[PDB]
Structures are given as structure tokens and as C-alpha cells.
Amino acid sequence: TPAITLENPDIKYPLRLIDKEVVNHDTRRFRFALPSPEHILGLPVGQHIYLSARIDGNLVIRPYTPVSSDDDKGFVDLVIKVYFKDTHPKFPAGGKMSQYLESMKIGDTIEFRGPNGLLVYQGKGKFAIRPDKKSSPVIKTVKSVGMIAGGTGITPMLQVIRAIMKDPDDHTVCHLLFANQTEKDILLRPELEELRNEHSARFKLWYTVDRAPEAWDYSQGFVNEEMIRDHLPPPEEEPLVLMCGPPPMIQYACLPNLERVGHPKERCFAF
Ligand SMILES: Cc1cc2nc3c(=O)[nH]c(=O)nc-3n(C[C@H](O)[C@H](O)[C@H](O)COP(=O)(O)OP(=O)(O)OC[C@H]3O[C@@H](n4cnc5c(N)ncnc54)[C@H](O)[C@@H]3O)c2cc1C
Ligand SMILES: NC(=O)c1ccc[n+]([C@@H]2O[C@H](COP(=O)([O-])OP(=O)(O)OC[C@H]3O[C@@H](n4cnc5c(N)ncnc54)[C@H](O)[C@@H]3O)[C@@H](O)[C@H]2O)c1
Numbered sequence: 001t002p003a004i005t006l007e008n009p010d011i012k013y014p015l016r017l018i019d020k021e022v023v024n025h026d027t028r029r030f031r032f033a034l035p036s037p038e039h040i041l042g043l044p045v046g047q048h049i050y051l052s053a054r055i056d057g058n059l060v061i062r063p064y065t066p067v068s069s070d071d072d073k074g075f076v077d078l079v080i081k082v083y084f085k086d087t088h089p090k091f092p093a094g095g096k097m098s099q100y101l102e103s104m105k106i107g108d109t110i111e112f113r114g115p116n117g118l119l120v121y122q123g124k125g126k127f128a129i130r131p132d133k134k135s136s137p138v139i140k141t142v143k144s145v146g147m148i149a150g151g152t153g154i155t156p157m158l159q160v161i162r163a164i165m166k167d168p169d170d171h172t173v174c175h176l177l178f179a180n181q182t183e184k185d186i187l188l189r190p191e192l193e194e195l196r197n198e199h200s201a202r203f204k205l206w207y208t209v210d211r212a213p214e215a216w217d218y219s220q221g222f223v224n225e226e227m228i229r230d231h232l233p234p235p236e237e238e239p240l241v242l243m244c245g246p247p248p249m250i251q252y253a254c255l256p257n258l259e260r261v262g263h264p265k266e267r268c269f270a271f
Contacts, residue, residue: 002038002039002040002070002073003035003036003038003039003040004039004040004041004042005034005035005039005040005041005042005076005112006041006042006043006049006112006113006114006115007042009113009114009115009116010113011113012052012111012112012113013035013111013112013113014109014110014111014112015032015033015034015035015076015109015110015111015112016032016033016107016108016109017030017031017032017104017105017106017107017108017109017110018031018032018033018075018106018107019031019106020106023079023187023188024184024185024186024187025184025185026081026082026083026084027079027080027081027082027152027187028079028080028082028102029067029077029078029079030077030078030079030080030101030104031075031076031077031078032075032076032078032110032112033074033075034073034074034075034076036074037073037074038073038074039073039074040070040071040072040073041066041068041070041072041076041115042070042115043066043068043069043070043076043114043115044115044120044121045069045120045121045122045123045159045160045163046117046119046120046121046127046156046159046160046271047065047114047115047116047117047119047120048063048064048065048066048114048115048116048117048156049063049064049065049066049076049112049113049114049115049116050062050063050064050112050113050114050116051063051064051097051101051110051111051112052110052111052113053097053100053110053111055096055097055100056096058096060096060097060100062097062098063116064078064080064155065078065155065156065159065271066078066155066159067079067155067158067159067162067188069159069162069163071166076112078155079152079154079155079158079187079188080098080101080152081098081151081152081187082094082095082098082099082101082102083095083098083099084099085099117156117271118130118131118132118133118269119156119242119269119271120137121159121160121163121164122139123163123167123170124141124167124169124170124171124172125141125142125143125170125171125172126139126140126141127139127140127141127142127240128140129269140240142172142238142239142240143171143172143173143237143239144172144173144174144175144233144237144239145160145172145173145174145175145233145239145240145241145242146175146177146228146232146233146239146240146241146242146263147160147161147174147175147176147177147232147241147242147243147244148176148177148179148223148228148232148241148242148243148244148245148249148254149176149177149178149179149243149244149245150178150179150180150223150244150245150246150249151179151180151181151185151187151245151246152187153243153244153245153246153249153271154178154187154188154244155244156242156244156271157176157178157242157244158188158191158192160174160242161174161176161195161203162195164202165195165198165199165202165203170202171202172202173201173202173203173204173233174202174203174204175204175206175231175232175233175239176192176203176204176205176206177206177207177208177223177227177228177231177232178192178205178206178207178208179207179208179209179210179222179223179245179249179253180207180208180209180210181209181210181211182209182210182211182213183209183212183213183216185209186207186209192205193205204231206218206219206227206230206231207219208220208221208222208223208227210222219231222249222252222253223249223253223254223257224253224257225257225260225261227257228254228257228258228260228261228263229261232261232263235261235262235263235264235267238267239263239267240267240268240269241258241263241267241268241269242268242269242270242271243268243269243270243271244270244271250270254270255268
């Protein structure tokens with residue numbers, strides 16, 4: 001068995017940045033080396049890590065959700081949106097940690113800790129979900145999972161999707177509804193469409209964008225009732241519905257429409 005990196009969630013492990021790849025205009029994949037090429041991160045599927053640093057004199061701690069897995073020896077991949085300064089009128093300073101990360105050079109290090117999170121995917125449709133941080137996991141096994149992601153909210157979904165597709169005996173069907181501001185904002189589109197091409201029986205894919213291009217074959221606007229009805233499994237099939245995105249997407253676009261369609265709160269989970 002491979003050596004684990006994250007052995008205690010309170011210990012800080014400095015990892016070195018070894019690669020960075022542009023995902024799109026504001027998003028990148030950051031690859032960090034584990035302590036040896038034979039190490040694994042130690043990451044139950046669905047959990048996240050925290051990065052921390054002193055930035056401009058203040059402690060800054062932020063969670064990020066690896067898109068890699070414990071099958072990936074020697075590295076961890078994060079997919080992170082950079083919030084640039086002098087860009088958005090409401091946030092002229094931009095984002096602290098994301099800009100710090102964008103400024104890192106290959107070879108620089110930052111401290112990781114984890115893993116954390118209330119959901120663990122245990123394979124073959126089986127989810128272990130704690131009601132909160134002080135309770136025991138409730139083990140819920142389903143035949144299908146609805147996934148509603150907005151922007152970088154794609155990251156926990158991709159962890160779960162990849163874990164499922166890797167196991168040919170995992171027959172769980174994932175239905176992803178992925179919302180972004182524009183077509184160019186769709187993160188990891190090639191990766192997602194390769195998954196669709198290779199696993200269409202287990203992976204259903206739909207997009208919505210705030211603003212649609214001329215020739216568009218998907219949906220437009222915030223997540224609405226029609227998209228949930230048409231692009232997630234019906235409530236009669238008792239799927240789990242996983243959500244991840246901006247808090248108002250969850251509060252105003254997801255929850256009320258899940259209610260309208262008939263997905264009970266018990267079947268729903270927000271990362
Ligand atoms: C459990 C969990 C897991 C997460 N995993 C991921 C992940 O895998 N990948 C990821 O990218 N994020 C993830 N996030 C978000 C992440 O933790 C940070 O909140 C994010 O990176 C911003 O932090 P910051 O320090 O750069 O910005 P902050 O300084 O804390 O805040 C800036 C905020 O103002 C807004 N803002 C600032 N500048 C702009 C701009 N130019 N345009 C638009 N809005 C702007 C944004 O809302 C931004 O969050 C996750 C959040 C949670 C709770
Ligand atoms: N809790 C987690 O595990 C986790 C993991 C990754 C990301 N996230 C969160 O996901 C968000 C990603 O932000 P982003 O900058 O990439 O998103 P974004 O601003 O680019 O918005 C993406 C989509 O979210 C929806 N949305 C945004 N504002 C909305 C509103 N007021 N009402 C209804 N829908 C709205 C839209 O469909 C939009 O296209 C962040 O808030 C981040 O913290 C959470």
C-alpha cells in the first residue's frame with residue numbers, strides 16, 4: 001500500500017508547485033508534487049483540502065477540491081479560478097488566495113491540510129454522508145445521481161464522476177447540469193465531453209450559460225425548473241441530488257426548483 005501524505009487533518013504539509021495549465025481565461029489547473037513519486041494524497045472521494053498562507057500580513061485559509069484521486073501517484077491537481085483585481089467593479093481588490101496562487105512560480109511551496117467534507121463516495125453507488133460535522137455518516141446507495149454545478153463547483157462533481165467511470169462494475173448513472181456565465185467560461189469542457197463520448201450510458205451532460213452564443217444547442221439562463229426536470233433523473237427514481245456552486249445558485253436557483261420538481265430535501269446534498 002502506497003504511503004499517504006495527509007495523515008492527520010491538523011498537520012500542515014508544504015507541497016511544491018510543479019505544473020500549471022490554463023483551463024480558460026481565468027481558471028487554471030495547478031499540479032503539486034506529493035512528498036515522493038510513490039505517495040498518494042490520502043483523499044476519500046468527494047472530500048477537499050485547505051491551503052493556507054500569510055498574504056499581505058493576514059492569515060488566509062481557503063478550501064480547494066482536488067480533481068485527482070488516490071490512484072494518482074506523486075501529485076495532486078487543483079482547478080482554481082483566479083479572481084483578478086481591477087476587473088470587477090464590486091471587487092476591485094480581486095481575491096486574496098487565488099491571486100497569490102496565480103503569482104506562484106514553479107518550485108514554490110504552499111501548505112496543504114485535510115482531507116475534509118461531509119460526503120464520501122465509497123463506490124458502486126454508495127455514499128457516506130454525515131448530517132453535520134458531529135454526526136455519524138448515513139450510508140445511502142443509489143442507482144443514479146443528479147449533479148448541479150456552477151463554475152468551479154464542478155470540482156467535487158468531477159471527483160465523483162471520474163471515480164465512477166473508472167470502475168466498469170460501478171453502474172451508477174450521473175446526470176450533470178453545469179452552469180457558467182458564458183460559453184468560454186465552461187470549465188474542463190474537453191474533459192467532460194470525452195467522458196460523455198466514452199461513457200454515455202453512465203454520464204448525461206447538459207450545460208446552461210447566463211449568456212448564450214449564436215449557435216447554441218443547450219440551455220440559457222440561471223438553473224430553472226425546466227432544466228432540473230429535463231436533465232436530472234426524475235424523483236420517482238429516488239436519485240441523490242448533489243449541488244455545488246455560488247451560494248445564491250444553491251439558495252435561489254436549485255432548492256426552490258428541486259422542490260417544485262419533487263426532489264425531497266433528504267435526497268439533496270450541497271457541498
Ligand atoms: C468546500 C469548498 C471547496 C472549494 N473548492 C474550490 C475549488 O476546487 N476551486 C476553486 O476555484 N474554488 C473553490 N472554492 C472557493 C475557494 O475556497 C475560495 O473561496 C476562492 O478561491 C476565492 O478565494 P480568494 O482568497 O481568492 O478570494 P477572496 O479574497 O476571499 O474573496 C473574493 C471574492 O470576491 C469576489 N471577487 C473578487 N474578485 C472578483 C472578480 N475579479 N470577478 C468576480 N468575482 C470576484 C469573489 O466572490 C471572491 O470569492 C471552494 C469553496 C469551498 C467552501
Ligand atoms: N462548497 C464546495 O465544496 C465548493 C467547491 C467548489 C466551488 N464552490 C463555490 O462555487 C462558486 C463558484 O464561483 P464561480 O466564480 O466559479 O461562479 P460564477 O460567478 O462564474 O457563476 C457560475 C454560475 O453560478 C450561477 N450563479 C451565479 N450567481 C447566481 C445567482 N445570484 N443566482 C443564481 N445563480 C447564480 C450561474 O448559473 C452562473 O453561471 C464559489 O462560490 C465557490 O465557493 C464550492
